From Swiss-Prot:
Part of the full-length chain shown: 110 to 326 of 326
Positions with a binding annotation for a carbohydrate: 173-175
UniProt: Ca(2+) binding residues: 153, 155, 157, 159
A domain as annotated region, ranges: 6-45
Name of this protein: Ficolin-1
Length: 217
């Protein structure tokens, strides 16, 4: 039953699923999809669509890989651009970015709304107001940009940002954040090609953990 089933992780939390983990939800078109629910962070009910923790998974992937999703339920993944669109089409979803450095410090950024458009509009980022958080704001500067991968350049640069910079993102010319960049393990000498959130640790520090997640506003 789709119209009865959970639409997102907050629906699951409301029904007494108190531990984080993988659960089936029903997308707007009633397709079932297994997603990671973060029930532990900031009240819980978050649907996680990106997670890095150890560099075990290669994130320097093509349009196809990002479109469908890749990685492991047991570790690092990207849920998939088709999936992220479907998840964020209904209602208003807040975005939370959780970051952890190699010195064990947890930082976060919250945004009042977050939507990605369909493939026809290149999974364009539609981002609401920055709320706050220790990590600072490195995503507003990407608002209204298409998603790009190495093999499909939709950025606003004469260059290919995804190739630069070794990731996949709503690149502008080119980025303030690059959470799908190389897992560089803390400080790095290469410029802006790591898991970077520039408002916090700048362009030459690659985070240990990155998570991107959504909850009804
Ligand atoms: C990684 C990256 O793209 N860095 C570029 C940044 C970002 O676009 C930015 O800081 C947006 O917040 O802009 C510059 O500093 C700039 O044009 O002055 C050039 C730099 O190469
Ligand atoms: Ca370009």
């Amino acid at each position: 039953s789709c119209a009865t089933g959970p639409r997102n992780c907050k629906d699951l939390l409301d029904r007494g699923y108190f531990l984080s983990g993988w659960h089936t939800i029903y997308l707007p078109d009633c397709r079932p999809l297994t997603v990671l629910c973060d029930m532990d962070t900031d009240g819980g009910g978050w649907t996680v669509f990106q997670r890095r923790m150890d560099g075990s998974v290669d994130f320097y992937r093509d349009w196809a890989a990002y479109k469908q999703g890749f990685g492991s339920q047991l570790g690092e993944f990207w849920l998939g651009n088709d999936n992220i669109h479907a998840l964020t089409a209904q209602g208003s979803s807040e975005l939370r970015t959780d970051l952890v450095d190699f010195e064990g410090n947890h930082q976060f950024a919250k945004y009042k709304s977050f939507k990605v458009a369909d493939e026809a509009e290149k999974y364009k980022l539609v981002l609401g107001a920055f709320v706050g958080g220790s990590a600072g704001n490195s995503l507003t500067g990407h608002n209204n940009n298409f998603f790009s991968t190495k093999d499909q350049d939709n950025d606003v640069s004469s260059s290919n940002c995804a190739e630069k910079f070794q990731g996949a993102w709503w690149y502008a010319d080119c980025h303030a954040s690059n959470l799908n960049g190389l897992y560089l393990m803390g400080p790095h000498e290469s410029y802006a090609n790591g898991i970077n959130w520039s408002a916090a640790k700048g362009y030459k520090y690659s985070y240990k953990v990155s998570e991107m997640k959504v909850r009804p506003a």
